[PDB]
Write a protein that binds this DNA or RNA. Sequence first.
DNA 1: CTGG
Length: 45
Amino acid sequence: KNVKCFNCGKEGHTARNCRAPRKKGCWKCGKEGHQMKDCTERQAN
DNA sequence: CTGG
Ligand SMILES: [Zn+2]
Ligand SMILES: [Zn+2]
């Protein structure tokens, strides 16, 4: 879809789809033990 | 925009 992947960089898909290795922690937030949104990725408030 |  002409989108660069969060942790792989290659386009035509998204992080999870990319064959390359996945990020251990949250992509947007970094932390570990959850998805991307669940963690303080963007001031949950 | 896209999400594990
Ligand atoms: Zn990728
Ligand atoms: Zn996080």
